[PDB]
Design a protein around this ligand. Structure first.
Ligand SMILES: O=C(O)c1sccc1-n1c(Cl)ccc1Cl
Ligand SMILES: O=C(O)c1sccc1-n1c(Cl)ccc1Cl
Ligand SMILES: O=C(O)c1sccc1-n1c(Cl)ccc1Cl
Ligand SMILES: O=C(O)c1sccc1-n1c(Cl)ccc1Cl
Lengths: 145, 145
């Protein structure tokens, strides 16, 4: 709902780790293939996200993701708080993650490296379209705000 | 001028390479520390950029940056053309690059890793403010378009 809310999770594919951020209000995605799930990678991703968009709160489906000193420090520096208004469903964000994995599978054979296929899939997801695309919606929501 | 125009260049610091993209109309920046200057890294950066913003043309101060088959293929896939309306000055974009290096130097001792300091500097640059910030201007320009 609020335009400052993002959700971050990781997904595994081909023995690699995909960090997926979803802007909750728009469905817009940013993603990165990272070598392993570590607090350092999560912290770095959060700082990059925060320099690009007005990130006020962040949610996740795996709370332990956010416990390291390194993540907390990135939080702290960028003024990011943890989001507590989205309950855990033992999910809309998890569906978009499954959609993204669907798109990855559909484009995977067109790229040599998984990391390329992920960015192809993000591009497809954000530009696909009343009826606007997620990329159009995020800029509208933020500009209006 | 046109909202689809970006400029990409590399900068060197501490034996590492910083790839800097500037949205020409707004002054908004995205940057990444990459291990070396290669066409693969440039291509990957361009795909990520293109999935996030409506990238129509790209300029650079080092034309040889864009000759590899890998960059051309990323171009091709994302529908990016080379920008030919910005002449080379043997520069506004080069000033912002120097501004960013100024900010990096000012925050460098607050982070262990250069890559963190770069993202701190991008955050500072994009959020600093009539009088709007570059981050505010890019979303306004794109939303209006
Ligand atoms: O580089 C640092 O000193 C800081 S300061 C706050 C987070 C980090 N960090 C990131 Cl981001 C990745 C690895 C580290 Cl350490
Ligand atoms: O192609 C589809 O059926 C759907 S459905 C939602 C996204 C996409 N998509 C893929 Cl996968 C590649 C290009 C597009 Cl558009
Ligand atoms: O992964 C690929 O097959 C393609 S397809 C077009 C560019 C690339 N690429 C990137 Cl992006 C980084 C390294 C490579 Cl290869
Ligand atoms: O601090 C300044 O003089 C300027 S001047 C332009 C940006 C900045 N800046 C830095 Cl460097 C850290 C925080 C800010 Cl704001």
């Amino acid at each position: 709902s609020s335009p400052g809310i993002w959700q971050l999770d990781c997904t595994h594919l081909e023995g690699k780790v995909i960090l997926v951020a979803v802007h909750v209000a728009s469905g817009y995605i940013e993603a990165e293939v990272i070598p392993a799930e570590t607090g350092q990678e999560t912290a770095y991703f959060l700082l990059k996200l925060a320099g690009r968009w007005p990130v006020k709160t962040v949610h996740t489906d795996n709370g332990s993701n956010f416990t390291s000193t390194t993540v907390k420090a990135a939080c702290w520096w960028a003024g990011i708080k943890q989001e507590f208004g989205i309950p855990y469903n033992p999910g809309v964000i998890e569906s978009m993650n499954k959609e993204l994995k669907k798109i990855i599978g559909q484009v995977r054979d067109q790229a040599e490296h998984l990391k390329t296929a992920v960015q192809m899939a993000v591009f497809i997801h954000n530009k696909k379209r009343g009826g606007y695309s997620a990329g159009e919606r995020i800029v509208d929501i933020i500009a209006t705000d």
